[PDB]
Amino acid sequence: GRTVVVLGGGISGLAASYHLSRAPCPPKVVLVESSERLGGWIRSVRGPNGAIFELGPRGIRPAGALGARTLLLVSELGLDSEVLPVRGDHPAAQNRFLYVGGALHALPTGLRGPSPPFSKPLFWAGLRELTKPRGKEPDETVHSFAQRRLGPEVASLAMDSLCRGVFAGNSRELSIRSCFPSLFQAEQTHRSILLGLLLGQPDSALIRQALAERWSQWSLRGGLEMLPQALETHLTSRGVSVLRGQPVCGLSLQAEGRWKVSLRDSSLEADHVISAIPASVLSELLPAEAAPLARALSAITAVSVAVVNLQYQGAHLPVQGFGHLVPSSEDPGVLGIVYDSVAFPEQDGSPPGLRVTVMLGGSWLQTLEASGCVLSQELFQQRAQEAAATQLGLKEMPSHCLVHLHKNCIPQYTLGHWQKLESARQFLTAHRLPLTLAGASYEGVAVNDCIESGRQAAVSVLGTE
Ligand SMILES: Cc1cc2nc3c(=O)[nH]c(=O)nc-3n(C[C@H](O)[C@H](O)[C@H](O)COP(=O)(O)OP(=O)(O)OC[C@H]3O[C@@H](n4cnc5c(N)ncnc54)[C@H](O)[C@@H]3O)c2cc1C
Numbered sequence: 001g002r003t004v005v006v007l008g009g010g011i012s013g014l015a016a017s018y019h020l021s022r023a024p025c026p027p028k029v030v031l032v033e034s035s036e037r038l039g040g041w042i043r044s045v046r047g048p049n050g051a052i053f054e055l056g057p058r059g060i061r062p063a064g065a066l067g068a069r070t071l072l073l074v075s076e077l078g079l080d081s082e083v084l085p086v087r088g089d090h091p092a093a094q095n096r097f098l099y100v101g102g103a104l105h106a107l108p109t110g111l112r113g114p115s116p117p118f119s120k121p122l123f124w125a126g127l128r129e130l131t132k133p134r135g136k137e138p139d140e141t142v143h144s145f146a147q148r149r150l151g152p153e154v155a156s157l158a159m160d161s162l163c164r165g166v167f168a169g170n171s172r173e174l175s176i177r178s179c180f181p182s183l184f185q186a187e188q189t190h191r192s193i194l195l196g197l198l199l200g201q202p203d204s205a206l207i208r209q210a211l212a213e214r215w216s217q218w219s220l221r222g223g224l225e226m227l228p229q230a231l232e233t234h235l236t237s238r239g240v241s242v243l244r245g246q247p248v249c250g251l252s253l254q255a256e257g258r259w260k261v262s263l264r265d266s267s268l269e270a271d272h273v274i275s276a277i278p279a280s281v282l283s284e285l286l287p288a289e290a291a292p293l294a295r296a297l298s299a300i301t302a303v304s305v306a307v308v309n310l311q312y313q314g315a316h317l318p319v320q321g322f323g324h325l326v327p328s329s330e331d332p333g334v335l336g337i338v339y340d341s342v343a344f345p346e347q348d349g350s351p352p353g354l355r356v357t358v359m360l361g362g363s364w365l366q367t368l369e370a371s372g373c374v375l376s377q378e379l380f381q382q383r384a385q386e387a388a389a390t391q392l393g394l395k396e397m398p399s400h401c402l403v404h405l406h407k408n409c410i411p412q413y414t415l416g417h418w419q420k421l422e423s424a425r426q427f428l429t430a431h432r433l434p435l436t437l438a439g440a441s442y443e444g445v446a447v448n449d450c451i452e453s454g455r456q457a458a459v460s461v462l463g464t465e
């Protein structure tokens with residue numbers, strides 16, 4: 001007999017529980033979720049008119065080894081017939097925009113480089129980049145890194161916007177080493193980003209089709225939530241114990257180095273624990289003897305994001321594309337807008353209606369959260385509608401609106417994040433604690449990364465017995 005408890009029923013926790021239960025000689029697995037539902041930030045709402053409104057991720061990229069692993073999981077879960085891809089022969093896969101100076105500007109795609117809002121090169125900017133010195137510090141902020149090797153314009157207009165689109169965060173506080181590993185390694189190793197990227201994967205039917213059709217992203221017909229739903233179904237089917245509505249309240253070691261997972265008014269013993277909850281939360285569950293680990297984990301915080309889904313009957317966008325990003329110099333509060341209907345017309349409902357999703361956050365939301373201002377649904381709906389009106393020419397009143405304030409939903413990998421992870425890792429091994437870390441708080445926030453962190457936790461835990 002052997003029991004493994006997984007804390008957190010988000011995509012990372014589900015992936016870990018899934019891989020543990022698929023092993024040849026699986027241990028007893030118990031997945032403990034605090035809320036009434038599994039899936040974490042992956043959540044889909046089915047509107048009155050039949051349209052799908054995503055409240056978190058709304059598509060997954062198949063590129064790279066991780067994207068391939070995720071598609072392999074989709075096949076194993078038998079979700080093939082539900083896959084909705086955005087094929088390479090569409091504008092949602094070949095067009096990203098930046099809203100700057102009262103207008104939407106297409107970002108350079110191919111080698112075409114003569115491109116507003118940029119002054120002159122992108123030929124020239126990348127030219128002096130190949131000759132730019134190599135940073136000698138163990139870490140650097142994205143902004144500093146960007147301005148030093150790419151210039152002020154690329155830093156303020158491109159990297160600033162990209163950090164908001166991926167991490168809903170501030171490039172002046174985010175780590176290049178942790179947030180854009182590839183760019184950091186390129187510079188350190190080859191001494192040049194471009195030069196380094198030029199020097200430079202499971203298999204399945206879906207993966208082959210994704211490559212042949214050049215998918216930029218994919219989702220699922222009834223909403224991305226179908227993914228955690230399928231995982232949950234398979235777990236219950238494999239005899240895995242899933243507890244919902246039961247937040248973990250404490251962790252402590254006892255007889256024969258077994259964990260004591262304390263719930264509200266219940267308790268569970270575990271030979272090993274896989275923590276797939278936010279680092280700040282685990283930090284508080286740890287016993288007194290793990291104070292150093294708790295301190296390393298508490299240093300990892302997350303920003304909030306307010307998601308506003310807007311639908312318009314009979315309206316159209318100024319341009320066709322994936323969506324657009326908004327630099328912090330344009331509007332701290334409006335991170336960007338995704339053109340959901342361009343990518344997935346099949347989820348527009350009937351009668352079909354134009355759908356866009358406005359992501360709010362930045363210093364605007366942070367200062368309000370820190371202030372006594374009541375974060376009402378009205379405030380977010382108003383700012384989102386105004387953003388759509390000004391940035392997309394959609395002055396019409398939305399026919400449907402959904403507002404969700406997601407508290408501390410995207411971990412921020414700030415300067416020194418790598419050392420917070422190193423410290424936690426060394427404490428765990430040095431004290432031989434039967435605890436493994438997984439999820440967005442550590443090695444990546446993307447769903448592909450979270451799934452992989454869950455799989456890796458399962459592998460390391462199964463190896464030990
Ligand atoms: C609006 C937005 C848009 C996004 N878009 C994309 C995108 O399109 N592409 C992409 O790749 N990624 C995207 N992401 C990021 C990605 O969705 C997340 O990083 C990822 O889903 C987080 O998964 P997780 O398992 O690590 O954490 P979570 O989903 O937050 O799950 C952790 C779970 O642990 C539970 N928990 C907490 N405390 C306890 C306790 N004590 N006991 C038991 N359970 C507990 C929580 O209830 C939660 O469900 C987006 C995120 C946001 C919110």
Ligand SMILES: O=C(O)c1cc(Oc2ccc(C(F)(F)F)cc2Cl)ccc1[N+](=O)[O-]
Pocket residue numbers: 095096097162164165166167168169305322323324325335336337338359410
């Ligand atoms: O994927 C993007 O970079 C992108 C994200 C957008 O919207 C968001 C989605 C998710 C988040 C997140 F994850 F930070 F919450 C922020 C924003 Cl602004 C809008 C436009 C783009 N884009 O490339 O043109």
